[PDB]
């Protein structure tokens with residue numbers, strides 16, 4: 303029950319005895335949704351973070367660093383695809399991945415499906431620089447379970463599927479039959495990327511996912527690491543998965559430097575794309 | 591029973607760790623030194639802070655120590671004499687001593703209480719301090735370099751909490767200096783100023799290497815890797831660690847990570863071009 307001048311505290315008993323906190327300057331939303339607890343607040347204006355959204359007590363987006371995860375998920379996937387015309391985003395109700403995907407001129411259409419219509423509604427109201435994308439005629443934004451949506455999608459529908467979900471503990475649980483559906487709705491040159499969890503907190507989950515996405519039938523799976531200061535332990539990654547064999551996602555197939563928007567990006571470029579697949583030695587076995 | 595870190599220069603944000611046992615908590619002649627055992631159900635193990643800022647934990651100390659120690663020595667053609675300024679915990683020293691080329695390392699930390707407490711509470715980090723190839727001094731690094739002859743060291747590593755010209759001077763012509771380089775999230779203007787200042791004092795190149803450190807503010811920190819000799823590209827390894835016999839003992843650093851560390855987010859890339 304957040305209050306202006308109080309502190310928002312994030313502790314996860316999955317990760318016992320550590321917490322991160324932000325002082326609240328103004329509460330904008332704090333209420334149960336049909337699916338999760340949604341909290342939006344202006345952080346201290348003497349600090350850099352700007353507006354903050356949390357879902358079930360976990361920070362999802364801040365103004366100051368939202369571009370990292372949205373650019374990495376959107377560009378690492380589309381720049382690894384020869385011609386990504388039709389795109390699906392699962393989750394992504396805030397709009398960020400979709401903004402990045404729609405930067406690409408090859409994209410004719412992007413479907414977005416998020417289970418929580420209130421996340422879209424509140425992002426339009428409170429994160430206009432993230433959510434501007436949701437009204438693009440190139441986008442179809444739907445409220446629904448991603449699980450059901452892919453089960454009812456025909457084979458060979460999408461070039462790229464991006465799974466921009468919350469974590470395994472919540473409404474995103476089965477998103478970690480689903481992975482076979484994703485394989486099946488992808489076209490032959492299909493690329494899938496997901497929300498891939500932390501090498502510090504979730505390294506065994508990452509090993510398990512990578513192994514079983516390969517076994518499901520993807521020909522290759524490479525984890526891309528990125529720097530996100532408001533995420534637990536300061537990083538997160540994405541598993542970038544190719545349907546087709548003989549594809550090296552760790553070097554850009556279509557370098558963003560050749561596209562008109564390269565200079566508008568705040569994090570991603572081809573050097574960062576390459577660098578993101580180099581993992582600390584203790585985690586390198588994910589990628590080999 | 592929690593340790594809370596919030597800094598006055600970054601207002602309205604805090605990081606906290608549960609204290610299981612306070613091991614040490616006293617001012618020193620120089621700074622406040624706190625050592626505690628953190629929650630045994632979490633990963634961090636024993637924690638050391640200096641003036642309220644986490645400096646080492648059992649769980650992640652290998653990152654910053656391997657990156658400073660190896661990014662610098664692997665960028666040097668044959669590093670035989672090394673100086674560490676600060677480094678009282680012994681971590682950078684442990685990494686530097688892995689290298690067969692090293693004949694001698696001097697380490698000069700202003701605070702002898704830090705070495706003392708590190709021997710008591712971080713034996714995996716501080717064992718290096720007793721090595722026959724090391725000389726450990728208690729003293730201010732600023733005065734130490736002023737009193738050091740020209741061309742004494744192949745590498746100077748500044749692992750801290752007139753000087754830079756002294757560092758330039760005490761380095762041999764192929765000398766490498768690396769330092770504790772601050773955060774691109776919280777200190778980006780400091781990093782630009784320092785990279786410019788160092789180049790101005792007369793190092794020929796300065797390149798910032800970014801690393802992932804979960805317990806540092808915003809989860810990363812970097813090091814400026816500075817070459818005295820012009821024409822040196824420190825962003826690719828000069829002496830790849832894979833060709834040395836301890837490569838597989840490392841938990842973070844290798845040549846891919848070395849190359850990767852110099853790739854900066856676009857918003858920060860003007861630090862390196």
Ligand SMILES: C[S@@H](CCCN)C[C@H]1O[C@@H](n2cnc3c(N)ncnc32)[C@H](O)[C@@H]1O
Pocket residue numbers: 357362363371392393394395396398399415416417418421446447448449466467468473474475477
């Ligand atoms: C906010 S977004 C993550 C923040 C970085 N853009 C995560 C979204 O996943 C949605 N989500 C969670 N589970 C599902 C399912 N099952 N289907 C679709 N969308 C889902 C949830 O409502 C968030 O908006």
Ligand SMILES: C[S@@H](CCCN)C[C@H]1O[C@@H](n2cnc3c(N)ncnc32)[C@H](O)[C@@H]1O
Pocket residue numbers: 620640645646654675676677678679681682698699700701704729730731732749750751
């Ligand atoms: C603990 S170490 C940094 C943690 C990563 N190993 C920071 C050290 O720098 C020392 N320090 C600070 N100022 C100086 C000066 N001027 N000289 C030498 N050592 C110094 C300080 O006592 C710490 O032990």
Ligand SMILES: O=C(Oc1cccc2cccnc12)N1CCCCC1
Pocket residue numbers: 312313314317320321322531532533534535536605606607804805806
């Ligand atoms: O990730 C840390 O704090 C956090 C920062 C950001 C988010 C978090 C979410 C849950 C738990 N913690 C979080 N740490 C780890 C290193 C010591 C300080 C606390």
